[PDB]
Amino acid sequence: DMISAPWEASLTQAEHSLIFYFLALTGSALLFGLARTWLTRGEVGARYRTAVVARSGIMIVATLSYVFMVLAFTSGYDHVGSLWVPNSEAIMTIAPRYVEWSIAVPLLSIELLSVATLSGVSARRTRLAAVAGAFLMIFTGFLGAVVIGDGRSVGSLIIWGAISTVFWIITAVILIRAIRHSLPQLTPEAAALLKTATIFLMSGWAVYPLAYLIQILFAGGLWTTSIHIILCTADIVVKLGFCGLIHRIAKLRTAEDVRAGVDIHTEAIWISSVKQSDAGIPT
Amino acid sequence: DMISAPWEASLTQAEHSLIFYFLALTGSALLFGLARTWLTRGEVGARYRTAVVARSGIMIVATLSYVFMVLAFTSGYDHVGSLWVPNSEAIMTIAPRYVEWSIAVPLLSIELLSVATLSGVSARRTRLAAVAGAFLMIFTGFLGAVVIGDGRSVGSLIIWGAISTVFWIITAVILIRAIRHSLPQLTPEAAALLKTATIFLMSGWAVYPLAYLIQILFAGGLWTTSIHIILCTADIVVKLGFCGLIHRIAKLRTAEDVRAGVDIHTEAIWISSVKQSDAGIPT
Amino acid sequence: DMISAPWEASLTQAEHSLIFYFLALTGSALLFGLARTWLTRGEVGARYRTAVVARSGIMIVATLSYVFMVLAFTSGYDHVGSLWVPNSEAIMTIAPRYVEWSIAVPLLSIELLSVATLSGVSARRTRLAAVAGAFLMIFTGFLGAVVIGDGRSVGSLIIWGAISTVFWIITAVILIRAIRHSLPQLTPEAAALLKTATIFLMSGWAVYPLAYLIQILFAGGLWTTSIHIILCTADIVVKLGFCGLIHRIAKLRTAEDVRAGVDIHTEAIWISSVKQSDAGIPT
Amino acid sequence: DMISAPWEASLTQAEHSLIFYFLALTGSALLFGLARTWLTRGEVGARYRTAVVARSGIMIVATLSYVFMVLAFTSGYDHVGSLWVPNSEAIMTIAPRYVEWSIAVPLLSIELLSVATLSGVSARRTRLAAVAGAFLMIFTGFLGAVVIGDGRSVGSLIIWGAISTVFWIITAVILIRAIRHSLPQLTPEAAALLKTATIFLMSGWAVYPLAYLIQILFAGGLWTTSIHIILCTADIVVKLGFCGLIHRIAKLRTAEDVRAGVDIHTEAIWISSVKQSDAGIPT
Amino acid sequence: DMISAPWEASLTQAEHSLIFYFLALTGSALLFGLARTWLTRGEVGARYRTAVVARSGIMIVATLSYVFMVLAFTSGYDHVGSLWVPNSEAIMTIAPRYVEWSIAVPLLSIELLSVATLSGVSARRTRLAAVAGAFLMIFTGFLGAVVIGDGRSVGSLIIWGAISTVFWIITAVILIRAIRHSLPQLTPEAAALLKTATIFLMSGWAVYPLAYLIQILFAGGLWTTSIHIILCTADIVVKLGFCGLIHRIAKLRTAEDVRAGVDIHTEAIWISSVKQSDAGIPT
Ligand SMILES: *C/C=C(C)/C=C/C=C(C)/C=C/C1=C(C)CCCC1(C)C
Ligand SMILES: *C/C=C(C)/C=C/C=C(C)/C=C/C1=C(C)CCCC1(C)C
Ligand SMILES: *C/C=C(C)/C=C/C=C(C)/C=C/C1=C(C)CCCC1(C)C
Ligand SMILES: *C/C=C(C)/C=C/C=C(C)/C=C/C1=C(C)CCCC1(C)C
Ligand SMILES: *C/C=C(C)/C=C/C=C(C)/C=C/C1=C(C)CCCC1(C)C
């Protein structure tokens, strides 16, 4: 059957206002996250610098995405009467997300495996497979939701959604299997945090498919608002919450290495205002 | 009853000029603050780096808020005759503030608890509760003032204002209780500054609700100008004044740690052209 | 009587070209200055880091000001016939200066007292008084020249000019008294430079009031060009010249501290290709 | 014979969407790459800093290129009916690539020779010859494809394509001869990676000429989409893949130098979560 | 007699394309140069940091200039028929150069004297005289070519050109005399490079007056293209070539100081993959 794309529904002044708030809130929060990433990049050892690199990429891409979207929002809707009517630039308030997710979901997978105990070419097979799975899941989703059918075809939305879901399961299994292998080889305190962070990431990835089911099932300005709120909220929680969790595991692992003599760190490491390791100079 | 939103009043050339000055002054001052934050980030220990992270986020978000607003001012008012008439972009000269405050007030709470003596999961409960309270206070305010009623409904403004005030009291109590617990455990010199900084932040938070009462009670170009001046002024004083106070406490606490052997700092710490601690080398 | 605001005069192609050159030249020079400030920030001790902070703020705000003005120039004049006719945003080619000066003149006062021998709360008193005086001098000027009268009233220009001049004398006395107290307590070489820098700053502050007297006395495209040239030139000389002088005094004072054991500096200090102090390691 | 330039074909909503995705994806990935380059610049010794410099230039130029192109895409196609019709700004969605490649291909050659064993004036002859060849190959291509004939002449496309191909062979021979001389003088582990990286770069350079043959042979919206996808994909693989490979060789060579006493490095070097060298202090 | 300003000639699609390429190529190359300057700023001692400061300013200003010009090109010409017709924004594709040169030529003089053996107030007289001469040469040129006559008067072009040439000779003599005094006091290897760099800078300064003689003698789209190519090419060669040469002399001088005990450098210095000096610790 046919449906109306989320970007093809007229918004009341409330709905217009809420959407601008959330878009701008999310873009702001991600710019904070970018600063935080750069300001705390030296708390982690070079053995774990991939986590900083991934997180930096996530924050940059996502910040651009939201800037674009906020601007395309101001130019995608015009206040005809009491309602705001979508232009052609309305789709540019939703479509940039998939660009962002195409970079971010692969990078989030890398961030997670960064602090796991995989090394050498083993930390290459899993990394490629995850990156592949992650990108393919977003790309298949983009096809169903924006490209094939114009985001107005239920059958396209359902088919490509199912494809995207297969890749989800694949990526998720790969990651979870990798973590499950690492947990035994980490210290208890690290292993515990890494389990939590795996749960958080997977659980946060479950929210995004809900914004997809809405597009299939419900159309309206309420539902366009819902989608924006859900996705914006999810972004703040995942890209601020999860990226803080990985930094703490990287810090904790750095500190463990320092104590073990595996490496030396220029500054002391504090986690929760407790000193984990002291500063040291190359002997 | 029904009233006119601050952004729905025609400005005289004076009022237009004053508003552009203050908007631009505030945006400029916050960009100075951002530079100051980055240039002085290494004066503080890693045990207190959260203060610089919070302050950096505050300065960044607030700076883009004001940039947006300054641009939306130049495009939100058209010089019909001697007066400037508000367009649709007029609300974009006021609404972005709430986006900024939604990030900033939570971050200001974090900045304050950064230099208090809470640690571990204790420095997590309070931090989440404050962040929650702070965000909810701004968000409820945004609803009354921009969303529910279009900022033209007294009853909406009064109801959501009262809600926002409850969350204010909650956040304030949480913070003040946290500080009151820390003061005994700080050194006299730090405790004194931390008391002051708590008073300054709370006192500065009282000014913002006045701009809200104006919107309820008075409409006009004078009153739109008043609101802009009050809020701009408050921003400069709180986001420059308070953020300097927390940096001094962080520096003083760093210096105390250095003297106690709790940690080492690469550079000497000067506060008021008095040396607080010397530079040291890791082990 | 009534006059015509500087931004209300049609420019010949010469005058249009000269103004664009100077605006762009000044904006470029200030961007060079900003780079220079960041690139040389580590030549100075932490006891004098306020000088870098002030100078960084000056350069940033002034650079934005000129960017804004250059853009408002390209869009504020339309080539009707041989002449360029001012639009409504012609005033945006002159008004942003006062925003800049409102930040910069206070910051320049701070930069100067940074390298003087005032310490503790004594530094605070003088710093607040100067900052107050400086801002009030610019703000009163802005009122007379842009706000009260629309920059078309001689009596407003004369009254607010006189007010602004009182605050000038106040700020100048405060600063000069502070310097005169420091000179005895500095080393001869530093004292000499600090005297010079005081003369340079005060002397440079005398040029700006001339652009104000023009606006009162003469109107025309020649006179609008004169104002732009004078103010642009003054900005380059004061914000490049003076800010270099303070850096040399900060470097020289850093070097004196290093030699005295008051502090240690990571790199050697060179002034005029003469080594002032050697690099040292913390303890 | 007369043919239609890639930028002179109307795109279906699918093709429009795909192209925007890929353009934006590539621009995002290159901005990630730029961050990665800056964040990992200190993993390499100063003997190999040219690799970082080249890679930084590549990432910056390419990121600008894609930003320009993404913006020119939004303004180069107007949605007349179901199809998007190319404007005059359509050529600005394709032509900027050649600007980018004119910088990037020479820089990629430099990046490769950076980690080879050529030194002194020998590392000047080869470097100039390669830079010359590389630039001339792109420039001759630009002439055929954009300038001489307007990208609508088969004979121009064929002639300048053949010229560009001669320069390709020249550059490729120069590079390959340089590598083949270095491989024997490198350590096995480095030599192996350097062989691989040479194959990757040369192989990636083969993809770009395919987008050229399309322009000669096929015109259409499908083919304009194909060109964009091919070139975007190639950019991500070459500018992320290859630039990672050279960094690993630079890290490995740094680590070898550290172990040999040829130099000292401030931080330990990890490659694949295996420590290659320890951190050391100057003398 | 009267002539047509370079910006008053209609461009064929070829000429339009070539000009956009070169403008964009030059802007890109200068952005690479800016990155290179920042990435290699720590290879040089603090005794020679002026070279980095000058080079940074050059690259920044020149990059802005070209960005402005590239944008003014896209908006300065309208595709009437097969030809592109210049509007009022066409002059903004040529005039910004003189702003850039007004900063850059003085800065290039400073960069050169940075690595010569002048010190104290001696390194002040020459520096001011050169800066004066350099700026006056560009400014007099701007008058003849853009301001006095509108770039349409041969006699103005000839008179101001002759003035500009006098200042050229003055600056050149000052510089050459300074170098000729330094060469004897440098080490052979440095002296040789410094001679070369002097020749390169002076020789590159000779190219710019040719673009001026064209404007006097020839008008046309070919000739406006020629001017753009010549000036763009000259910029790449001088601003990238010369600024590399000065960095090598600064590195070599740093290394000589390190070996002599005049100073210590934190990193080893490599020039052409040959180690010039080792890394050292302050004490
Ligand atoms: C920071 C951004 C994140 C974590 C985005 C995640 C997005 C997904 C996990 C998307 C998954 C999808 C499906 C499984 C079904 C089809 C629709 C998608 C693309 C939303
Ligand atoms: C830097 C910005 C700051 C400190 C902003 C603070 C804003 C408040 C404390 C707002 C509080 C409000 C109420 C208590 C009542 C409703 C209106 C609000 C949102 C202004
Ligand atoms: C870098 C900018 C500087 C130093 C600006 C300084 C401006 C002044 C000192 C202005 C003073 C004025 C008066 C004393 C009279 C009224 C007019 C003013 C504002 C120009
Ligand atoms: C990162 C960008 C890269 C590596 C671009 C490479 C481009 C080429 C190798 C282009 C070569 C061409 C020919 C050999 C024939 C004519 C067409 C060209 C310019 C595409
Ligand atoms: C990177 C920019 C540089 C080096 C620019 C240099 C420009 C000149 C040396 C210009 C000189 C001129 C004359 C000597 C006479 C005619 C007018 C000028 C301005 C082109």
Side-chain angles (χ1 to χ4, degrees), chain D residues 197-231:
Chain D
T198 313
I199 302 171
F200 181 116
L201 184 71
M202 290 308 110
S203 306
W205 281 4
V207 181
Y208 291 83
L210 262 59
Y212 197 81
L213 295 189
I214 290 177
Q215 174 173 2
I216 309 178
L217 296 183
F218 311 109
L222 174 84
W223 301 114
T224 294
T225 311
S226 306
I227 286 163
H228 275 103
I229 294 174
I230 289 173
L231 291 180

Short mmCIF file of all heavy atoms in Angstrom, two decimals, chain D residues 197-231:
data_model
loop_
_atom_site.label_atom_id
_atom_site.label_comp_id
_atom_site.label_asym_id
_atom_site.label_seq_id
_atom_site.Cartn_x
_atom_site.Cartn_y
_atom_site.Cartn_z
N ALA D 197 50.93 -1.47 0.34
CA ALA D 197 50.37 -0.13 0.24
C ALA D 197 50.57 0.41 -1.18
O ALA D 197 49.70 1.12 -1.69
CB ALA D 197 50.98 0.77 1.27
N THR D 198 51.68 0.05 -1.82
CA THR D 198 51.92 0.45 -3.20
C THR D 198 50.86 -0.15 -4.12
O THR D 198 50.27 0.55 -4.94
CB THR D 198 53.33 0.06 -3.64
OG1 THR D 198 54.16 0.51 -2.57
CG2 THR D 198 53.72 0.71 -4.95
N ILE D 199 50.57 -1.44 -3.94
CA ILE D 199 49.54 -2.11 -4.71
C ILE D 199 48.18 -1.47 -4.48
O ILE D 199 47.42 -1.31 -5.41
CB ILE D 199 49.49 -3.61 -4.37
CG1 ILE D 199 50.85 -4.26 -4.64
CG2 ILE D 199 48.39 -4.28 -5.16
CD1 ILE D 199 50.98 -5.65 -4.15
N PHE D 200 47.88 -1.13 -3.25
CA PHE D 200 46.59 -0.56 -2.92
C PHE D 200 46.44 0.78 -3.62
O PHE D 200 45.38 1.05 -4.16
CB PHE D 200 46.45 -0.48 -1.41
CG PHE D 200 45.15 0.06 -0.90
CD1 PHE D 200 44.29 -0.75 -0.17
CD2 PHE D 200 44.78 1.38 -1.11
CE1 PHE D 200 43.09 -0.25 0.31
CE2 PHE D 200 43.59 1.88 -0.61
CZ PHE D 200 42.75 1.05 0.10
N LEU D 201 47.50 1.62 -3.61
CA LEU D 201 47.37 2.97 -4.14
C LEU D 201 47.23 2.92 -5.65
O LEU D 201 46.43 3.66 -6.22
CB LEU D 201 48.58 3.83 -3.77
CG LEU D 201 48.50 5.30 -4.20
CD1 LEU D 201 47.46 6.09 -3.38
CD2 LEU D 201 49.86 5.97 -4.11
N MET D 202 48.03 2.05 -6.28
CA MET D 202 48.04 1.98 -7.72
C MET D 202 46.69 1.43 -8.17
O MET D 202 46.10 1.92 -9.13
CB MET D 202 49.17 1.08 -8.20
CG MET D 202 50.56 1.69 -8.01
SD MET D 202 50.75 3.36 -8.69
CE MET D 202 50.87 4.32 -7.18
N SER D 203 46.21 0.42 -7.44
CA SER D 203 44.97 -0.25 -7.78
C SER D 203 43.79 0.70 -7.59
O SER D 203 42.84 0.70 -8.36
CB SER D 203 44.85 -1.46 -6.92
OG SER D 203 46.01 -2.27 -7.05
N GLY D 204 43.87 1.53 -6.57
CA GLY D 204 42.83 2.51 -6.34
C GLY D 204 42.85 3.60 -7.39
O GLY D 204 41.81 4.20 -7.65
N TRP D 205 44.03 3.89 -7.96
CA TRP D 205 44.13 4.92 -8.99
C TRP D 205 43.53 4.43 -10.29
O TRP D 205 43.37 5.22 -11.21
CB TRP D 205 45.59 5.33 -9.21
CG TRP D 205 46.11 6.29 -8.18
CD1 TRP D 205 45.47 6.73 -7.06
CD2 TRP D 205 47.40 6.93 -8.19
NE1 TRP D 205 46.27 7.60 -6.37
CE2 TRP D 205 47.46 7.73 -7.03
CE3 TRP D 205 48.49 6.90 -9.07
CZ2 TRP D 205 48.57 8.51 -6.72
CZ3 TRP D 205 49.58 7.68 -8.77
CH2 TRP D 205 49.62 8.48 -7.62
N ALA D 206 43.26 3.13 -10.40
CA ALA D 206 42.76 2.56 -11.64
C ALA D 206 41.26 2.75 -11.73
O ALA D 206 40.70 2.66 -12.81
CB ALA D 206 43.12 1.12 -11.72
N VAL D 207 40.62 3.04 -10.60
CA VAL D 207 39.18 3.09 -10.54
C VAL D 207 38.73 4.42 -11.13
O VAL D 207 37.71 4.50 -11.80
CB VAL D 207 38.69 2.88 -9.09
CG1 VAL D 207 37.18 2.90 -8.97
CG2 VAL D 207 39.23 1.57 -8.55
N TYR D 208 39.52 5.47 -10.89
CA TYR D 208 39.11 6.80 -11.28
C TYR D 208 38.96 6.89 -12.80
O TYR D 208 37.93 7.35 -13.28
CB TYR D 208 40.08 7.80 -10.65
CG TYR D 208 39.95 7.89 -9.13
CD1 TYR D 208 40.60 6.97 -8.32
CD2 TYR D 208 39.19 8.89 -8.52
CE1 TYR D 208 40.51 7.05 -6.93
CE2 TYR D 208 39.07 8.96 -7.14
CZ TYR D 208 39.73 8.04 -6.34
OH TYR D 208 39.60 8.14 -4.98
N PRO D 209 39.93 6.43 -13.62
CA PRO D 209 39.75 6.38 -15.07
C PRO D 209 38.48 5.67 -15.56
O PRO D 209 38.06 5.87 -16.69
CB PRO D 209 40.98 5.59 -15.57
CG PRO D 209 42.00 5.81 -14.51
CD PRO D 209 41.24 5.95 -13.20
N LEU D 210 37.84 4.83 -14.75
CA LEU D 210 36.59 4.20 -15.17
C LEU D 210 35.45 5.21 -15.20
O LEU D 210 34.61 5.16 -16.09
CB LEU D 210 36.22 3.07 -14.22
CG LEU D 210 36.59 1.67 -14.69
CD1 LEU D 210 38.10 1.53 -14.92
CD2 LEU D 210 36.10 0.66 -13.66
N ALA D 211 35.41 6.11 -14.23
CA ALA D 211 34.40 7.15 -14.23
C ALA D 211 34.56 8.06 -15.45
O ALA D 211 33.58 8.67 -15.89
CB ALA D 211 34.46 7.95 -12.95
N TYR D 212 35.78 8.15 -15.97
CA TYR D 212 36.06 8.90 -17.17
C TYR D 212 35.52 8.17 -18.40
O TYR D 212 34.91 8.79 -19.26
CB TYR D 212 37.56 9.14 -17.30
CG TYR D 212 37.99 10.23 -18.26
CD1 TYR D 212 37.97 11.57 -17.89
CD2 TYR D 212 38.43 9.92 -19.54
CE1 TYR D 212 38.40 12.56 -18.76
CE2 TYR D 212 38.85 10.90 -20.42
CZ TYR D 212 38.84 12.22 -20.04
OH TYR D 212 39.26 13.15 -20.95
N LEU D 213 35.72 6.86 -18.48
CA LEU D 213 35.24 6.11 -19.63
C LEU D 213 33.72 6.12 -19.68
O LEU D 213 33.13 6.00 -20.75
CB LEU D 213 35.74 4.67 -19.58
CG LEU D 213 37.24 4.52 -19.70
CD1 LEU D 213 37.63 3.06 -19.87
CD2 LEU D 213 37.79 5.34 -20.85
N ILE D 214 33.08 6.19 -18.52
CA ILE D 214 31.64 6.24 -18.54
C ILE D 214 31.24 7.52 -19.26
O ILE D 214 30.51 7.47 -20.24
CB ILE D 214 31.06 6.13 -17.12
CG1 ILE D 214 31.28 4.71 -16.58
CG2 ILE D 214 29.58 6.51 -17.06
CD1 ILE D 214 30.82 4.55 -15.16
N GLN D 215 31.76 8.65 -18.80
CA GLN D 215 31.40 9.93 -19.38
C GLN D 215 31.53 9.90 -20.91
O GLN D 215 30.71 10.42 -21.64
CB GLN D 215 32.26 11.03 -18.75
CG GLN D 215 32.06 12.38 -19.41
CD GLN D 215 32.78 13.50 -18.69
OE1 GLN D 215 33.48 13.27 -17.71
NE2 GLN D 215 32.58 14.72 -19.17
N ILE D 216 32.55 9.25 -21.43
CA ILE D 216 32.70 9.13 -22.86
C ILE D 216 31.57 8.29 -23.44
O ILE D 216 30.97 8.68 -24.44
CB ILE D 216 34.10 8.57 -23.20
CG1 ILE D 216 35.17 9.38 -22.47
CG2 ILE D 216 34.36 8.57 -24.69
CD1 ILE D 216 36.57 8.88 -22.70
N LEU D 217 31.26 7.14 -22.81
CA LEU D 217 30.47 6.08 -23.45
C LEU D 217 28.98 6.19 -23.16
O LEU D 217 28.18 5.92 -24.05
CB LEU D 217 31.01 4.72 -23.04
CG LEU D 217 32.43 4.43 -23.51
CD1 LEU D 217 32.89 3.04 -23.12
CD2 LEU D 217 32.55 4.59 -25.01
N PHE D 218 28.59 6.56 -21.95
CA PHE D 218 27.20 6.46 -21.53
C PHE D 218 26.74 7.77 -20.92
O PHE D 218 27.44 8.35 -20.09
CB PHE D 218 26.97 5.36 -20.48
CG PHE D 218 27.60 4.03 -20.83
CD1 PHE D 218 28.70 3.57 -20.14
CD2 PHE D 218 27.16 3.31 -21.93
CE1 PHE D 218 29.35 2.41 -20.53
CE2 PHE D 218 27.80 2.15 -22.31
CZ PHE D 218 28.90 1.69 -21.62
N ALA D 219 25.54 8.21 -21.28
CA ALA D 219 24.98 9.37 -20.60
C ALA D 219 23.57 9.02 -20.12
O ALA D 219 22.92 8.15 -20.70
CB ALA D 219 24.96 10.58 -21.50
N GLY D 220 23.14 9.71 -19.07
CA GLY D 220 21.90 9.35 -18.41
C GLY D 220 21.96 9.69 -16.93
O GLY D 220 23.02 10.01 -16.40
N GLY D 221 20.81 9.65 -16.26
CA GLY D 221 20.78 9.83 -14.82
C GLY D 221 21.34 8.63 -14.07
O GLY D 221 21.92 8.79 -13.00
N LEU D 222 21.14 7.44 -14.63
CA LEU D 222 21.73 6.25 -14.06
C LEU D 222 23.24 6.41 -14.03
O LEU D 222 23.87 6.17 -13.00
CB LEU D 222 21.33 5.04 -14.90
CG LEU D 222 22.01 3.74 -14.50
CD1 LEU D 222 21.23 3.09 -13.37
CD2 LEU D 222 22.12 2.79 -15.68
N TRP D 223 23.79 6.84 -15.18
CA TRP D 223 25.23 6.95 -15.36
C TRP D 223 25.81 8.12 -14.59
O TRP D 223 26.92 8.02 -14.09
CB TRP D 223 25.49 7.10 -16.84
CG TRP D 223 24.93 5.94 -17.57
CD1 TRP D 223 23.91 5.96 -18.46
CD2 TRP D 223 25.44 4.59 -17.54
NE1 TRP D 223 23.72 4.70 -18.97
CE2 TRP D 223 24.65 3.85 -18.44
CE3 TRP D 223 26.49 3.96 -16.87
CZ2 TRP D 223 24.86 2.50 -18.68
CZ3 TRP D 223 26.74 2.63 -17.15
CH2 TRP D 223 25.92 1.92 -18.03
N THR D 224 25.06 9.19 -14.42
CA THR D 224 25.54 10.22 -13.53
C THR D 224 25.58 9.71 -12.09
O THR D 224 26.45 10.13 -11.32
CB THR D 224 24.69 11.48 -13.63
OG1 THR D 224 24.94 11.95 -14.96
CG2 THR D 224 25.03 12.52 -12.59
N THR D 225 24.64 8.83 -11.73
CA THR D 225 24.60 8.28 -10.40
C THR D 225 25.76 7.31 -10.22
O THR D 225 26.43 7.30 -9.20
CB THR D 225 23.27 7.56 -10.14
OG1 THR D 225 22.23 8.45 -10.54
CG2 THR D 225 23.07 7.19 -8.68
N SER D 226 25.97 6.48 -11.24
CA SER D 226 27.06 5.54 -11.19
C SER D 226 28.37 6.26 -10.97
O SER D 226 29.19 5.81 -10.17
CB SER D 226 27.11 4.76 -12.44
OG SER D 226 25.83 4.19 -12.65
N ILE D 227 28.58 7.37 -11.68
CA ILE D 227 29.85 8.05 -11.60
C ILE D 227 30.03 8.53 -10.18
O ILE D 227 31.10 8.38 -9.62
CB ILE D 227 29.93 9.19 -12.65
CG1 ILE D 227 30.13 8.62 -14.05
CG2 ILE D 227 31.02 10.19 -12.33
CD1 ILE D 227 29.80 9.64 -15.13
N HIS D 228 28.99 9.07 -9.59
CA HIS D 228 29.09 9.65 -8.27
C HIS D 228 29.38 8.56 -7.26
O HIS D 228 30.10 8.79 -6.30
CB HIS D 228 27.80 10.35 -7.88
CG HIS D 228 27.73 11.75 -8.37
ND1 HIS D 228 26.99 12.14 -9.45
CD2 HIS D 228 28.36 12.85 -7.91
CE1 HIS D 228 27.17 13.44 -9.63
NE2 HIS D 228 28.00 13.89 -8.70
N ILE D 229 28.78 7.40 -7.46
CA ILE D 229 28.92 6.34 -6.48
C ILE D 229 30.34 5.83 -6.60
O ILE D 229 31.04 5.78 -5.59
CB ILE D 229 27.83 5.26 -6.64
CG1 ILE D 229 26.45 5.85 -6.30
CG2 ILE D 229 28.08 4.08 -5.75
CD1 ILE D 229 25.33 4.88 -6.57
N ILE D 230 30.76 5.49 -7.81
CA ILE D 230 32.10 5.00 -8.02
C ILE D 230 33.13 5.95 -7.41
O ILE D 230 34.00 5.52 -6.67
CB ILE D 230 32.35 4.81 -9.51
CG1 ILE D 230 31.54 3.63 -10.04
CG2 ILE D 230 33.81 4.61 -9.81
CD1 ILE D 230 31.60 3.47 -11.55
N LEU D 231 33.05 7.23 -7.70
CA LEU D 231 34.09 8.13 -7.27
C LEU D 231 34.04 8.34 -5.77
O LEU D 231 35.07 8.47 -5.13
CB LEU D 231 33.94 9.45 -8.04
CG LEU D 231 34.24 9.38 -9.54
CD1 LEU D 231 34.06 10.75 -10.14
CD2 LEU D 231 35.64 8.87 -9.82
#
